[PDB]
Write a protein that binds this ligand. Structure first.
Ligand SMILES: *[C@@H]1O[C@H](CO)[C@@H](O[C@@H]2O[C@H](CO)[C@@H](O[C@@H]3O[C@H](CO[C@H]4O[C@H](CO[C@H]5O[C@H](CO)[C@@H](O)[C@H](O)[C@@H]5O)[C@@H](O)[C@H](O)[C@@H]4O[C@@H]4O[C@H](CO)[C@@H](O)[C@H](O)[C@H]4NC(C)=O)[C@@H](O)[C@H](O[C@H]4O[C@H](CO)[C@@H](O)[C@H](O)[C@@H]4O[C@H]4O[C@H](CO)[C@@H](O)[C@H](O)[C@@H]4O)[C@@H]3O)[C@H](O)[C@H]2NC(C)=O)[C@H](O)[C@H]1NC(C)=O
Ligand SMILES: *[C@@H]1O[C@H](CO)[C@@H](O[C@@H]2O[C@H](CO)[C@@H](O[C@@H]3O[C@H](CO)[C@@H](O)[C@H](O)[C@@H]3O)[C@H](O)[C@H]2NC(C)=O)[C@H](O)[C@H]1NC(C)=O
Ligand SMILES: *[C@@H]1O[C@H](CO)[C@@H](O[C@@H]2O[C@H](CO)[C@@H](O)[C@H](O)[C@H]2NC(C)=O)[C@H](O)[C@H]1NC(C)=O
Ligand SMILES: *[C@@H]1O[C@H](CO)[C@@H](O[C@@H]2O[C@H](CO)[C@@H](O)[C@H](O)[C@H]2NC(C)=O)[C@H](O)[C@H]1NC(C)=O
Ligand SMILES: *[C@@H]1O[C@H](CO)[C@@H](O[C@@H]2O[C@H](CO)[C@@H](O)[C@H](O)[C@H]2NC(C)=O)[C@H](O)[C@H]1NC(C)=O
Ligand SMILES: *[C@@H]1O[C@H](CO)[C@@H](O[C@@H]2O[C@H](CO)[C@@H](O)[C@H](O)[C@H]2NC(C)=O)[C@H](O)[C@H]1NC(C)=O
Ligand SMILES: *[C@@H]1O[C@H](CO)[C@@H](O[C@@H]2O[C@H](CO)[C@@H](O)[C@H](O)[C@H]2NC(C)=O)[C@H](O)[C@H]1NC(C)=O
Ligand SMILES: *[C@@H]1O[C@H](CO)[C@@H](O[C@@H]2O[C@H](CO)[C@@H](O)[C@H](O)[C@H]2NC(C)=O)[C@H](O)[C@H]1NC(C)=O
Ligand SMILES: *[C@@H]1O[C@H](CO)[C@@H](O[C@@H]2O[C@H](CO)[C@@H](O)[C@H](O)[C@H]2NC(C)=O)[C@H](O)[C@H]1NC(C)=O
Ligand SMILES: *[C@@H]1O[C@H](CO)[C@@H](O[C@@H]2O[C@H](CO)[C@@H](O)[C@H](O)[C@H]2NC(C)=O)[C@H](O)[C@H]1NC(C)=O
Ligand SMILES: *[C@@H]1O[C@H](CO)[C@@H](O[C@@H]2O[C@H](CO)[C@@H](O)[C@H](O)[C@H]2NC(C)=O)[C@H](O)[C@H]1NC(C)=O
Ligand SMILES: *[C@@H]1O[C@H](CO)[C@@H](O[C@@H]2O[C@H](CO)[C@@H](O)[C@H](O)[C@H]2NC(C)=O)[C@H](O)[C@H]1NC(C)=O
Ligand SMILES: CCCCCC/C=C\CCCCCCCC(=O)O
Ligand SMILES: CCCCCC/C=C\CCCCCCCC(=O)O
Ligand SMILES: *[C@@H]1O[C@H](CO)[C@@H](O)[C@H](O)[C@H]1NC(C)=O
Ligand SMILES: *[C@@H]1O[C@H](CO)[C@@H](O)[C@H](O)[C@H]1NC(C)=O
Ligand SMILES: *[C@@H]1O[C@H](CO)[C@@H](O)[C@H](O)[C@H]1NC(C)=O
Ligand SMILES: *[C@@H]1O[C@H](CO)[C@@H](O)[C@H](O)[C@H]1NC(C)=O
Ligand SMILES: *[C@@H]1O[C@H](CO)[C@@H](O)[C@H](O)[C@H]1NC(C)=O
Ligand SMILES: *[C@@H]1O[C@H](CO)[C@@H](O)[C@H](O)[C@H]1NC(C)=O
Lengths: 343, 298, 431, 133, 52, 53
């Protein structure tokens, strides 16, 4: 039973060397994730009055008032204490316009539910990416190397001004103004420092992206599979460098079989899958033109603490709040009791 | 532990090669009457292809030649697969550029020319030694052997093997020491792991010779190899070791090189005080003298 | 845990031209390697020399061979099954915590930190003592507490080992053997509290309780020892990254880009920098060995004085109380001691008698300074350490030539009611 | 080194294992050494043990419990009643001055009568019998 | 007497651009500060525990 | 002991060269003496160093 919910009462989830979970409440719950016989990862009271715990992969989610997310390589197969014991996942589409408990709908989700859920999120008022987001196609942007595992504090284009979900372009994205469109959730009236493109089907674009530089040169990405009328003398991508008195095609790369993310910054750096492949001069804008993306987002560079596992992103903490600023300095999501130096 | 194949890895590309022909013309030794240096005819040239080669040609009439370089590379070494993101060469001064000075000694030397090199680092442009022919994929490598390699800009020697790991990000992975540990083949998604061609090992030296070796390799010049938890032991004696000469922890090595475990040291039994019942009372005492040294001063 | 570093590999990582340059500094490499190889050899000798094991004692420390009586010891003794760690030892090792190098030469996997350090020339040696040897050592020390003699039918019942220890602190006059049950019960409660302290102590621990000679303090110390163990290895490894004013931090990079003589000059800069990093490592490593030796010497004194014997030094074992016995448990990188100490709950208020005088002729005082004569709670004597009274005997007193104002004024006909075994021989003979 | 001289050389240490290690200390000698001192610790080591049965104490005629005063002294019957230090098998017969009276008896004490006492403790005198008879 | 040092202030004395550069070395600062804060905590505990 | 100080290495076991033995104490004496000048030569050698002059 991957999910166990309830409508003294208790929940017990088990696999002995790791952690197992127990929760108890009566009519606030005490949640204990510990190395129980027959120390603790977590041992605290949580507000409570349905109530339930769902765990899949290496995350445990506790649903008791605020949704709590615990990141740990757990191995659970059975659970013991109306009760709902859930072994098969489902999907709902939520329409929130009301900004309160009176959500408009929780419509059964009928298409692309996994992909939509994995890539689309509502933005928080302060531009934060909400806790619990999977960062499915989000990468840390590194010019050289890859952090395979560990915790890093770094300056990354992770603060969201505006996220356009399932965009339809049939659009000029300026780095001097805000981006036009309907933002999913909160929006911040700021120009982007970077444009993050989360790709659903790259053939949509291969079948136009133009970087408009500060000095007036138009850089266009041209990709082609077995057709080269102007390129000669699998897709191959060329960078068309179009200036007022000249057009040339520079070969850049054989297109990687899978491209999940492209990040274009204001300073010109273009990252495909987090490798900083091409650095151009400063950009004023990016033009997108196609009839293909899960999301397009306008973001800004902020310091953040990122946990990396197998090169994937999880658990991002933003270093804005004074409590968070301390956590970033000690490079730890959780800091024990003690005195710490702050300025 | 104890003619290498050459390996070369770049982001995927096909043959796309141009030459940078630098010609230095001059006549003399009574110094020069005249000189003129051009790059592909022009006073300057920038590389716009994925691969390029620099070829220096002299056309000098009368002469010994040499170069004085303030660059990270020489005119000859620049063609040994070095990678750049930008690369321009000029006989004129370029901003933020290094200089290579070309001199002649005609038999009273002269400077023929100054080549200014403006460049930035990255993977896009590579100074290969020559054009590739019949090549759909410029990158190449030899696996499971010691090889000399240039991988994504990293040079060194090592053994490249194929792993079953898979990562979704970047191009390469490194150690805390900045060494390449692994790299990805972008087209296939395969990850390769790179180890040194030689490893540190501990030798057991007894009397005047090597009695055996404790190592990470199963292959040696000894005729007897044993696998111990955590290491291999090479010797010319694979039998039980009953009389260790060298000991570390519980590992003992005999003079013949046999290896075995060293048993726990026994010691004096002390007797517990007892109020009632079967007890033993010590007798037949003899003296034993223990030796201890303590430093008093420095 | 000792470390050994291959100087040439660290400094010149496979480049043969670099090694030729390094040759002029061979003496530096010899110095670096010698210090690490010899120091490791010494730690191996001293630890293994110290931790001897008694077979007669080891055999008496199992769950079935240790005849505890009242006193529990289940969580202290090892587990026969081949023998495994005790419950307390298991909690400590699992709460806080040899490398395999046969894998580092295989490729196939992406190297982890240990293999990457190995590739760089840094080897972490097997521990000088295996965890199982620390376990057998500790089991031997405990089993030895009941080794009352050789060839006997059974281990000395634990309570007899205890009664003998109690007699050394004070002769016991209460021999009802009920006191042993009361002490056993307090012992068992103390073990239960320790066993539980190792499991989530932080839930409810006060400032007094986390201070010296407590579980939280000792447990914290064990974690600090383990957590800092690799701290020097990573400084040595990180410094390889450093570019000591060269084109590249990589020797192979430099030789493949510059001409040979210019390359020689920059590689020599890298060599000096790398040799400096090795010397810093060695100095840190040698310093740490000295600090550990000081702790090891103390641990040996504690075993010989608190475990194998009953210390007469107030405050040495446990601290602030009367020592009875101590137990030893294996711990990461060392030993954990459990010191069983008596603490009084109440005091008996009595009036001390400086001495007696009989008929103005004889001054009688006690021979032993640690024994006190008193009249409250008839004349009795008891050790100053415990209220264990008995009536005095003749053999308790000696004659002093002079009396003082603090001695009791008795006559010969009263003496016998003060000292029951006193006989006035002339009166018995004449009457 | 100063502690070793004061405790192992000028005096006989009572701390088990301090001087020499694992044995009974008798005396230590000191020799000069480069930069310091070298100590030679002379320690006794037993070769054999004598196997005896310990007597917890004696009871006489159900009225008096007699135990030894000194915890380090052991009463035994093998190898007649004798007492010796627990450290060395150096027997002598017990005397009156060795024992003290304890109010209660235990199951581990030897059951003796007054007419047997004198054959257990040779110096014991029953004064009433000598006076009456 | 224990000492505690604010890594960022010592290294980057109020300059915000410097602090952004310093971020790549955050682990060094954490190491420096942790050693001093924990050592001070330990000396406090042992001295006050001892002096009853 | 007197003999142990004269060629102990000819026939000494692991037990015999451990703590509180002649071979251990003798080894320690040599280490103390051999390392005595180790710092003097680092101070002296550094005079050789050219600090960018
Ligand atoms: C892979 O490598 C890449 C190449 O190195 C890395 O790229 C670097 O990325 C960093 C991080 O984004 C860039 O830092 C940023 O630099 C910005 C401007 O620098 C240029 O212009 C400066 C002049 O104007 C700026 O500074 C003056 C003060 O001096 C201010 O008054 C202005 O308001 C303005 O900010 C100049 O001083 C610089 O020298 C630089 O000039 C450029 O030099 C190159 C060299 O060849 C040249 O080619 C360019 O042509 C030349 N430019 C010009 C115009 O001639 C700077 O503005 C940024 O500070 C702002 O933004 C950051 C976030 O990015 C905030 O942290 C700051 O608080 C500040 O925020 C302000 O602006 C925000 C922008 O929207 C706004 O939202 C805020 O509200 C606020 O107003 C920042 O310091 C760096 O420039 C860049 N390298 C280069 C050379 O481009 C990649 O990072 C790396 N990828 C990874 C991560 O792996
Ligand atoms: C990285 O992985 C890629 C993908 O496997 C490797 O490319 C492959 O290289 C082989 C050998 O050259 C190619 O096989 C050849 O096919 C052609 C016909 O197309 C044939 O004429 C040759 O005789 C040979 O069989 C293969 O096509 C090619 N695969 C792809 C899709 O690229 C590449 O070699 C690896 N990188 C390195 C370092 O080489
Ligand atoms: C790069 O593309 C931009 C965008 O189309 C070009 O700017 C346009 O210029 C035309 C000239 O007739 C104007 O009519 C449009 O209003 C401009 N559009 C925008 C959004 O600026 C620009 O000319 C191109 N640059 C080059 C090198 O040709
Ligand atoms: C630079 O010199 C190269 C020689 O390395 C020239 O390439 C040659 O061109 C001739 C033209 O007839 C051919 O016959 C040769 O086969 C070519 N040799 C090679 C190795 O390619 C090249 O023309 C020169 N490049 C420029 C830009 O002037
Ligand atoms: C070597 O240099 C000489 C000049 O010293 C070159 O000869 C000149 O060639 C150009 C181009 O054809 C003519 O315009 C000049 O008239 C020639 N000058 C002389 C001195 O006759 C010659 O071409 C060069 N050789 C090479 C290999 O390029
Ligand atoms: C490894 O080689 C050694 C020789 O260096 C072998 O030792 C010899 O064994 C043969 C057996 O017939 C004897 O006749 C020789 O007298 C031995 N030589 C020596 C060293 O005296 C040894 O047998 C080999 N090791 C193994 C695995 O057995
Ligand atoms: C060294 O001695 C050990 C101990 O006798 C040998 O290990 C034994 O190997 C035999 C093989 O016939 C087994 O039957 C025993 O069970 C093993 N004993 C144990 C528990 O170690 C070992 O073979 C000897 N090593 C060599 C290669 O001589
Ligand atoms: C002696 O200690 C043992 C070990 O803690 C006790 O045995 C435990 O008894 C409890 C009773 O609730 C069980 O839950 C545990 O499973 C037992 N543990 C083991 C390993 O035996 C025993 O109760 C104690 N006995 C006395 C007399 O105190
Ligand atoms: C030592 O403990 C004994 C036993 O508990 C104490 O005797 C008790 O004294 C209290 C006084 O309030 C009485 O209520 C109990 O009935 C007594 N218990 C028995 C049965 O003895 C004694 O007080 C303690 N000794 C001292 C010095 O106080
Ligand atoms: C016990 O006897 C002593 C010794 O006689 C008494 O102390 C004396 O008291 C008289 C009183 O006049 C003094 O003159 C002497 O100087 C005292 N002698 C000493 C030894 O100081 C003492 O009073 C008697 N105590 C009791 C309890 O009767
Ligand atoms: C202490 O030493 C004595 C003297 O050597 C031992 O007595 C000997 O016992 C052996 C037993 O085999 C006899 O062969 C000798 O004849 C005895 N020697 C004499 C003359 O006494 C005695 O065994 C030792 N004590 C213990 C406890 O064994
Ligand atoms: C010595 O005397 C003691 C005390 O009387 C004896 O122990 C008693 O044995 C009887 C047997 O019926 C029991 O009823 C009593 O409970 C026991 N008393 C004690 C002190 O526990 C003991 O048997 C005698 N031993 C010898 C050697 O005769
Ligand atoms: C329409 C153009 C969008 C795709 C542009 C592709 C950019 C170059 C492709 C080669 C990327 C090689 C470096 C990053 C690849 C990777 O890390 O997997
Ligand atoms: C302006 C600040 C003055 C500093 C005064 C310090 C007084 C309180 C001590 C705080 C630091 C204590 C060291 C760490 C102790 C701990 O971790 O609990
Ligand atoms: C959600 O409801 C709003 C009304 O505010 C509507 O505009 C929008 O189309 C709805 N979205 C979905 C999920 O259909
Ligand atoms: C656009 O950039 C110019 C550069 O000077 C700036 O003055 C202006 O404020 C920017 N416009 C917006 C919308 O911010
Ligand atoms: C796959 O790679 C992992 C990396 O940890 C390794 O542990 C495992 O043995 C590998 N499995 C195979 C296929 O050998
Ligand atoms: C105990 O002592 C007795 C008598 O001395 C003896 O017979 C026995 O062998 C000894 N050991 C045992 C079995 O307790
Ligand atoms: C008892 O008589 C003996 C005979 O020698 C004598 O020495 C002693 O003083 C007398 N004791 C008393 C109490 O007078
Ligand atoms: C001997 O007689 C004395 C006279 O006081 C008496 O106190 C004592 O109890 C008697 N002893 C015995 C053995 O009964």
């Amino acid at each position: 039973v991957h999910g166990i919910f309830v409508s003294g009462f208790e929940i017990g989830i088990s696999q002995p060397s790791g952690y197992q979970l127990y929760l108890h409440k009566a009519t606030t719950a005490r949640l204990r994730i510990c190395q129980f016989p027959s120390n603790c990862l977590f041992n605290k009271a949580i507000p409570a009055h349905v109530v339930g715990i769902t765990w899949d992969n290496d995350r445990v989610t506790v649903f008791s008032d605020k949704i709590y997310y615990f990141y740990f390589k757990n191995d659970w197969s059975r659970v013991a204490t109306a009760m709902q014991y859930v072994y098969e996942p489902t999907y709902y589409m939520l329409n929130v316009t009301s900004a309160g408990e009176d959500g408009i709908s929780y419509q059964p989700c009928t298409a692309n539910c996994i992909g939509y859920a994995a890539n689309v999120f509502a933005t928080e008022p302060n531009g934060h990416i909400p806790e619990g987001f999977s960062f499915n196609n989000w990468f840390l942007l590194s010019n050289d190397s890859t952090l395979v595992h560990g915790k890093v504090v770094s300056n990354q284009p992770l603060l969201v001004n505006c996220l356009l979900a399932i965009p339809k372009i049939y659009q000029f994205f300026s780095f001097n103004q805000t981006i036009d469109g309907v933002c999913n959730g909160a929006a911040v009236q700021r120009a982007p420092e970077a444009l993050r493109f989360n790709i659903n089907d790259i053939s949509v674009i291969l079948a136009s992206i133009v970087l408009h530089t500060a000095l007036g040169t138009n850089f266009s990405f041209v990709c082609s599979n077995s057709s080269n009328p102007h390129l000669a003398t699998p897709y191959y991508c060329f960078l068309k460098v179009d200036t007022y008195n000249s057009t040339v095609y520079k070969f850049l790369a054989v297109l990687p079989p899978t491209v999940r993310e492209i990040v274009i910054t204001k300073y010109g750096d273009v990252y495909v899958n987090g490798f900083g492949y091409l650095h151009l001069g400063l950009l004023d804008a990016v033009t997108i033109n196609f009839t293909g993306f899960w999301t397009i987002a306008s973001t800004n560079f902020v310091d953040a603490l990122i946990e990396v596992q197998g090169t994937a992103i999880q658990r991002i903490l933003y270093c804005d709040d004074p409590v968070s600023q301390l956590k970033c300095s000690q490079v730890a999501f959780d800091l024990d009791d003690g005195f710490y130096t702050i300025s | 532990s104890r003619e290498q194949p050459i390996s070369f890895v770049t982001l995927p590309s096909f043959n796309d090669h141009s030459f940078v022909n630098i010609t230095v013309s001059a006549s003399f030794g009574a110094n020069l009457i005249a000189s003129d240096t051009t790059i592909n005819g022009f006073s300057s040239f920038c590389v716009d292809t994925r691969q390029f080669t620099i070829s220096l040609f002299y056309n000098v009439t009368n002469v010994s030649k040499s170069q004085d370089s303030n660059c990270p590379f020489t005119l000859q070494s620049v063609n040994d697969y070095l990678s750049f993101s930008k690369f321009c060469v000029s006989t004129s001064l370029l901003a933020s550029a290094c200089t290579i000075d070309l001199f002649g000694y005609p038999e009273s030397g002269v400077k023929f020319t100054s080549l200014y090199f403006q460049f930035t680092k990255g993977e896009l442009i590579t100074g290969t030694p020559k054009p590739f022919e019949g090549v759909t994929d410029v990158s190449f490598m030899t696996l499971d052997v010691c090889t000399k390699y240039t991988i994504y800009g990293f040079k060194g020697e090592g053994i490249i093997t194929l792993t079953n790991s898979s990562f979704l990000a970047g191009v390469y992975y490194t150690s805390d020491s900045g060494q390449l540990l692994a790299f990805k083949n972008v087209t296939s998604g395969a990850v390769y792991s790179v180890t040194p061609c030689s490893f540190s090992e501990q030798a057991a030296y007894v009397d005047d010779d090597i009695v055996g070796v404790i190592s990470s390799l199963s292959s040696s010049t000894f005729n007897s190899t044993r696998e111990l938890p955590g290491f291999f032991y090479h010797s010319n004696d694979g039998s039980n070791c009953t009389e260790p000469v060298l000991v570390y922890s519980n590992i003992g090595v005999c003079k013949s090189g046999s290896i075995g475990y060293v048993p726990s040291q026994s010691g004096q039994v002390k007797i517990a005080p007892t109020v009632t019942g079967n007890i033993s009372i010590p007798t037949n005492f003899s003296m034993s003298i223990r030796t201890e040294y303590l430093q008093l001063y420095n | 845990t000792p470390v050994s570093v291959d100087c040439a590999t660290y400094v010149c990582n496979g480049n043969s031209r670099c090694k030729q340059l390094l040759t002029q500094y061979t003496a530096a490499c010899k110095t670096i390697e010698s210090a690490l190889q010899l120091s490791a050899r010494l730690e191996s000798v001293e630890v293994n020399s110290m931790l001897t094991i008694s077979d007669e004692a080891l055999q008496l420390a199992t769950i079935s061979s240790f005849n505890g009586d009242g006193y529990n010891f289940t969580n202290v003794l090892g587990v026969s099954v081949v023998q495994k760690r005790s419950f307390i030892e298991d909690l400590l090792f699992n709460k806080v915590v040899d490398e395999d190098y046969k894998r580092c030469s295989n490729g196939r996997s992406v190297a982890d930190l240990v293999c990457a350090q190995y590739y760089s020339g840094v080897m972490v040696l097997p521990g000088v003592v295996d965890a199982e040897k620390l376990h057998m050592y500790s089991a031997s020390l405990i089993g030895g507490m009941v080794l009352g003699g050789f060839t006997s039918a059974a281990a000395l019942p634990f309570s007899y080992a205890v009664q003998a220890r109690l007699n050394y602190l004070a002769l016991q006059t209460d021999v009802l053997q009920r006191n042993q049950q009361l002490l056993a019960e307090s012992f068992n409660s103390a073990i239960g509290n320790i066993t539980s302290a190792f499991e989530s102590v932080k839930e409810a621990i006060s400032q007094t309780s986390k201070g010296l000679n407590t579980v939280a303090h000792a447990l914290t110390k064990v974690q600090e020892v383990v957590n800092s163990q690799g701290a020097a290895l990573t400084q040595l490894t990180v410094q390889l990254q450093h570019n000591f004013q060269a084109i590249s931090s990589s020797i192979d990079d430099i030789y493949s880009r510059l001409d040979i003589l210019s390359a020689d000059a920059q590689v020599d800069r890298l060599i000096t920098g790398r040799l400096s990093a090795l010397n810093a490592f060695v100095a840190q490593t040698l310093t740490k060995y000295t600090e550990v030796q000081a702790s090891r010497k103390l641990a040996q004194q504690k075993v010989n004085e608190c475990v194998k014997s009953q210390s007469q030094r107030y405050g040495f074992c446990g601290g602030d109380g009367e020592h009875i016995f101590s137990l030893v448990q294996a711990a990461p990188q060392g030993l954990l001691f459990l010191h069983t100490v008596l603490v009084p709950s109440d005091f008996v208020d009595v009036i001390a008698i400086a001495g007696l005088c009989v008929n103005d002729e004889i001054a009688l005082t006690l021979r032993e300074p640690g024994l006190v004569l008193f009249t409250h709670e008839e004349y009795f004597v008891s050790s100053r350490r415990m209220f264990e009274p008995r009536k005095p005997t003749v053999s308790d007193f000696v004659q002093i030539e002079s009396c003082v104002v603090t001695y009791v004024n008795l006559t010969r006909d009263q003496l016998p009611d003060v000292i029951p075994d006193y006989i006035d021989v002339n009166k018995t003979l004449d009457e």
